[PDB]
Amino acid sequence: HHANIDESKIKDTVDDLIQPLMQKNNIPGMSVAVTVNGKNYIYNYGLAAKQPQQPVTENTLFEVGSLSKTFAATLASYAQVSGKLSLDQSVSHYVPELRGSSFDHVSVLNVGTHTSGLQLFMPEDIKNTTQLMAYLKAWKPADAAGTHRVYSNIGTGLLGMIAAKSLGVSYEDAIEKTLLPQLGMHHSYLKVPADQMENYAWGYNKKDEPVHVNMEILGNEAYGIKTTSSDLLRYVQANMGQLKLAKMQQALTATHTGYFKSGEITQDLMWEQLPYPVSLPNLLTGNDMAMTKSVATPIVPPLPPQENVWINKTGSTNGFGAYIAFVPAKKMGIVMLANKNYSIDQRVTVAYKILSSLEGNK
Numbered sequence: 136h137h138a139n140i141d142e143s144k145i146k147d148t149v150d151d152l153i154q155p156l157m158q159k160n161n162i163p164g165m166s167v168a169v170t171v172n173g174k175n176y177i178y179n180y181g182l183a184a185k186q187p188q189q190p191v192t193e194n195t196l197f198e199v200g201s202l203s204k205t206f207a208a209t210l211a212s213y214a215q216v217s218g219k220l221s222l223d224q225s226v227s228h229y230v231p232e233l234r235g236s237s238f239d240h241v242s243v244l245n246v247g248t249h250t251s252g253l254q255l256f257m258p259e260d261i262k263n264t265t266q267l268m269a270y271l272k273a274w275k276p277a278d279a280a281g282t283h284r285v286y287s288n289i290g291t292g293l294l295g296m297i298a299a300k301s302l303g304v305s306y307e308d309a310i311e312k313t314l315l316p317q318l319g320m321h322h323s324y325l326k327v328p329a330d331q332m333e334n335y336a337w338g339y340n341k342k343d344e345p346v347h348v349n350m351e352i353l354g355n356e357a358y359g360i361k362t363t364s365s366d367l368l369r370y371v372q373a374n375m376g377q378l379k380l381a382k383m384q385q386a387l388t389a390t391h392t393g394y395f396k397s398g399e400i401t402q403d404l405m406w407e408q409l410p411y412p413v414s415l416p417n418l419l420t421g422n423d424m425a426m427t428k429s430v431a432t433p434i435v436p437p438l439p440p441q442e443n444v445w446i447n448k449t450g451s452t453n454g455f456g457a458y459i460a461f462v463p464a465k466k467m468g469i470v471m472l473a474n475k476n477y478s479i480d481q482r483v484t485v486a487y488k489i490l491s492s493l494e495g496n497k
């Protein structure tokens with residue numbers, strides 16, 4: 136602790152919110168990463184595993200659940216800026232087995248914005264590509280694609296699958312061999328390697344059992360990433376153009392294009408945003424859209440990537456709870472990782488309090 140140092144003030148702000156949060160929710164371990172003024176701060180708390188006990192360190196890997204959807208979008212955006220994908224084309228244009236199905240009328244943009252109408256969860260009985268394609272050929276949305284927003288793991292799966300195919304590789308290769316390496320995210324994985332298993336935190340479910348996420352079909356696209364807070368802070372900085380990584384920077388920025396309004400949010404390519412300065416009530420409402428259908432209204436022409444917005448994404452698994460938010464105009468961002476799935480309203484509120492503390496009022 137030092138005087139006249141913003142770092143000590145930030146640590147106090149973060150500690151004072153995170154310690155009670157972890158106590159009352161019984162969260163075993165967290166890492167919080169903050170960037171502001173071009174400086175990066177990483178704060179680690181508690182335990183990556185209870186038995187045998189292992190502390191959270193700079194190397195601890197957390198499951199981030201739906202933060203993974205933003206990587207599928209970044210890959211699709213990379214394919215798009217590389218000339219391999221048009222977001223306005225239909226899904227069946229790129230997946231010829233689906234020609235003649237309802238996917239003749241669902242665009243890639245629809246699956247990238249949760250506006251196809253596909254339901255939230257993949258049917259549990261779908262285990263292989265044959266069963267998946269049979270389901271998709273038989274599926275019909277309740278409303279015309281493009282009229283409603285239904286947050287969807289399945290649609291995100293299609294987005295990433297199409298993006299990878301357009302690049303000539305599997306999704307796993309696209310992410311681990313192309314995207315994460317080009318972003319400099321060397322401790323981010325869909326499959327944690329043997330030399331990193333000691334760093335892979337256990338998640339603690341509602342009954343406090345240690346669990347790791349089970350990876351099923353198209354799951355890598357929707358929920359597969361394990362990563363460190365430092366790697367995600369780099370991802371946040373890259374999303375704010377702060378790093379010397381040109382196609383990749385274009386791809387990152389273009390994911391922030393605003394395509395639909397729904398409720399309080401602007402739906403980008405997987406990322407979600409609200410105008411900044413943003414009120415806590417609207418941010419909370421905008422982060423309570425995970426399981427219900429809402430009306431979606433197109434933004435056409437699309438809203439270009441903005442500076443004056445709060446861009447964010449939640450992610451969870453049975454054992455983990457994560458959140459990212461950043462405001463490009465202020466070059467400030469936060470990553471909050473936990474090995475217990477605690478409520479989104481608390482993640483958002485803590486992040487709002489932290490970011491609001493980072494400069495004076497004017």
Ligand SMILES: *P(=O)(O)OC[C@H]1O[C@@H](n2cnc3c(N)ncnc32)[C@H](O)[C@@H]1O
Nearest residue numbers: 200201256257288358449450451452453
């Ligand atoms: P985001 O973190 O909002 O959502 C992804 C998490 O939802 C759960 N989940 C999605 N899809 C499935 C399937 N098919 N089976 C079991 N669980 C699923 C996971 O917790 C994801 O991490």
